[PDB]
Amino acid sequence: EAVRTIRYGLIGAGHMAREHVRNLALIPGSLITAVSDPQPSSLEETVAEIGYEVTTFPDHRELLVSGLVDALVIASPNDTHLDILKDIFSNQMKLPVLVEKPVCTTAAQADELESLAAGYSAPVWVAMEYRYMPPVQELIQAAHGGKLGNVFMLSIVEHRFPFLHKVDAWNRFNERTGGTLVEKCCHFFDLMRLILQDEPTRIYASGGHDVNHMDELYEGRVSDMIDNAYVVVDFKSGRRAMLELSMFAEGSKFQERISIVGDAAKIECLIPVAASHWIEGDESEAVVEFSPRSPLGPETHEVPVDEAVLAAGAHHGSTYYEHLGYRKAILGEGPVEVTVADGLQSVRMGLAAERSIIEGRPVELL
Amino acid sequence: AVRTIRYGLIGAGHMAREHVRNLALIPGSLITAVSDPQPSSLEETVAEIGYEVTTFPDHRELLVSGLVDALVIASPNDTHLDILKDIFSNQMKLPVLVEKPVCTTAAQADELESLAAGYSAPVWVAMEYRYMPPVQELIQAAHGGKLGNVFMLSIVEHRFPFLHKVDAWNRFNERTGGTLVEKCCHFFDLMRLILQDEPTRIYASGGHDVNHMDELYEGRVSDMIDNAYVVVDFKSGRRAMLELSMFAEGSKFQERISIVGDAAKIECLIPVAASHWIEGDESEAVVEFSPRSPLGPETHEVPVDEAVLAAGAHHGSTYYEHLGYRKAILGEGPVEVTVADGLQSVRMGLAAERSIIEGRPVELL
Ligand SMILES: NC(=O)c1ccc[n+]([C@@H]2O[C@H](COP(=O)([O-])OP(=O)(O)OC[C@H]3O[C@@H](n4cnc5c(N)ncnc54)[C@H](O)[C@@H]3O)[C@@H](O)[C@H]2O)c1
Ligand SMILES: NC(=O)c1ccc[n+]([C@@H]2O[C@H](COP(=O)([O-])OP(=O)(O)OC[C@H]3O[C@@H](n4cnc5c(N)ncnc54)[C@H](O)[C@@H]3O)[C@@H](O)[C@H]2O)c1
Ligand SMILES: O=S(=O)(O)C[C@H]1O[C@H](O)[C@H](O)[C@@H](O)[C@@H]1O
Ligand SMILES: O=S(=O)(O)C[C@H]1O[C@H](O)[C@H](O)[C@@H](O)[C@@H]1O
């Protein structure tokens, strides 16, 4: 068939950018030619990870007119996404974008992004990749395919470690992250829309900042972000979903549990902690359990992931399959599967959840 | 000399027969009197007791029979308060183990609260789940500090549709108090027990989505909820979530309870009762303790005595409930589940039903 070279530019050269790098290295015809980051420590580490020569820029505006790129990846702090997108949108080269979640951090940003994105002709993909985890993909196919009968309930449990230290401590305050239920939980709101094939009408949440980062001072201020919550989401069709989050439950062997209940069957998956975050040599595999109602007899199977695909990132192989899809979108050989529209809904959902917590009331979604 | 107790059973149906089988495992337990307005129920229950007793159609004659030291009530939910009132005004004041829910409406609860404070003899509300051996390990771990400061409690119940009962009593909200009372009082009460706190706010989303759509009473179908998510806030800032599906009987584990603190997480999985699962494929209950700091979860099976497990469908819990009630009858020990505990569980469930209906959280005092 012949591998077609795509020249990628990376705007933001931090932790997640380096994961993008390792996933692009598994995909023939993936050439990184330009990297931007205002911090040279980040560029040194990232160039080293790429392991071949590239052109670096401290500002993305020069990368955009460098003439070196066919497609962009944005992995900068959450509150910078809209501003970089605006510069891409007004650039005269119409370049495809894979923009990291959350696509934006406030309601004002979302209102503005919505108008600007509809006027842009090139593909814009929001990098919420969890659907591409092989076990999650099995649950989606089962739900969409009717293997559960009519679907009514969706539970998502994420039990994990506290937010990691980042460059300039950008992820410690709501003002830069959009809040925990945007930063961390947009993934889950979007899976709810995808799995249930419906739109949310009402969100209620209870949560707090109970445990984490109490001993970290940023100009004498303590982090204001949530570290645990319960969220209950209603949908137009009458389906209902629940998210449980703890950022202080890293002892849990399985970091994610997703369960779906229909009137014919239940299905569930358990996703292990990424090797880099768990005990060496105590690796569990992801499992899927299908539990029909009628002839009682559950079935459990492991869902293997290619060794190299799994080791290239910390999201159970998902970033690789995200890149296969984005590549196809760049070539015009496939559609954008996670759109700006999907991004905006996930953000508004998370924003509504944060407001619900703070004001002790459910929030309607329009 | 053990100390014999003569038990009277008011209500002689399915749960009464479980009470019977558990009492048969406890020396000094003699059933002498059974009451039930339906003779089919009495026949089946007498057969289960397997020795002669005196039967009555009405509990009022049982109460003055002279045959009893203590009572067990296992009648339909909406009859509890009326039987308790007759017990409360009886000349011989007898201890009562009254089945959940202790009552079905807010009017009943207001009335029960005043009447029960004026009654001198023990009244135990028979919410037994705390005595399931795996749940008891979770309670001790939470109370004992093994999790550090406790913040989160999740309870997931995935089970079969409500069973067919005598006179189809459990199909409408007006007789049951609604699903979040009938079925979920157990869970509201465990929340109060495990978190050692009082609720301030409750929110729920639920519907009647799947079950009993083909069972008709003059063209009317059951109006009861068959699935729900409930989120409960507590005075201290602790938070709990209950998930319920009455159409998820395919699940090998019927109950999942998890508790998260700032030092550790603990979780149990409770198997489906043998009588409701495939023969020969019974699973053991597991408890998993998951510390944060030295990564390294620990998993163990929690055995239950074979006869204790086979005597009931609540994983041995009814046995340990009866050990406690026995002590209360003898003046050897306190009532561990009081009427006050019953009322809180009911008002929690009633608030949850109102939350669903009004689309808003309901404040609790
Ligand atoms: N999809 C996922 O699974 C996933 C996982 C982690 C992070 N992310 C997202 O990736 C983004 C980056 O997070 P991270 O973990 O890489 O953090 P990081 O702190 O390791 O990297 C951020 C980098 O951006 C640079 N930067 C700061 N301001 C910039 C600007 N204006 N323009 C360009 N670069 C700028 C910083 O110098 C740093 O190198 C965020 O949106 C985060 O939410 C996504
Ligand atoms: N604690 C538990 O785990 C558990 C389990 C099952 C049932 N229960 C409770 O037990 C009670 C009975 O439920 P069940 O499953 O045994 O139902 P069932 O229908 O099997 O038995 C109920 C019995 O009560 C009798 N009855 C009806 N009206 C009566 C009255 N006025 N006085 C006396 N008896 C009367 C009926 O004739 C019938 O035999 C309910 O409160 C139910 O919620 C508790
Ligand atoms: O653990 S941190 O790196 O602090 C935070 C990150 O955690 C996961 O990777 C999520 O996918 C991601 O959305 C989030 O940005
Ligand atoms: O399955 S049914 O017998 O219809 C329903 C009953 O059964 C369960 O065991 C619960 O413990 C009990 O509280 C509830 O009333």
Numbering used by the authors:
A (entry chain A): 7 to 372
B (entry chain B): 8 to 372
Give the article text.
Here, we identify an alternative approach to sulfoquinovoside hydrolysis that is adopted by these organisms and discover a family of SQases belonging to a new glycoside hydrolase family (GH188). These new SQases operate through an oxidoreductive mechanism that results in net hydrolysis and involves a catalytic NAD+ cofactor. The structures reveal homodimers, consistent with molar mass analysis using size-exclusion chromatography-multiangle laser light scattering in solution.
Both ternary complexes were essentially identical, with respect to the active site interactions. In the ArSqgA·NAD+·SQ complex, SQ is situated above the nicotinamide ring, with C3 of SQ 3.4 Å away from C4 of the nicotinamide ring, at an appropriate distance for hydride transfer and oxidation of C3 of an SQ glycoside. A range of specific interactions occur with the hydroxyl groups of SQ: C1–OH at 2.5 Å from His321 and a water molecule; C2-OH with Tyr136 (2.6 Å); C3–OH with His193 (2.7 Å) and Lys107 (2.6 Å); and C4–OH with Glu189 (2.6 Å). The characteristic 6-sulfonate group of SQ engages in a triad of interactions in the ArSqgA·NAD+·SQ: one oxygen H-bonds to Arg166 (2.6 Å), a second to Lys172 (2.9 Å), and a third to the backbone amide of Leu170 (2.8 Å). Superposition of ArSqgA·NAD+ binary and ArSqgA·NAD+·SQ ternary complexes (backbone RMSD of 0.5 Å over 364 residues) revealed no major structural changes upon binding SQ. All of these residues are conserved across the studied SqgA homologues. Superposition of the ArSqgA·NAD+·SQ and AmGH109A·NAD+·GalNAc complexes shows that His259 (His193 in ArSqgA) and His404 (His321 in ArSqgA) are structurally conserved.
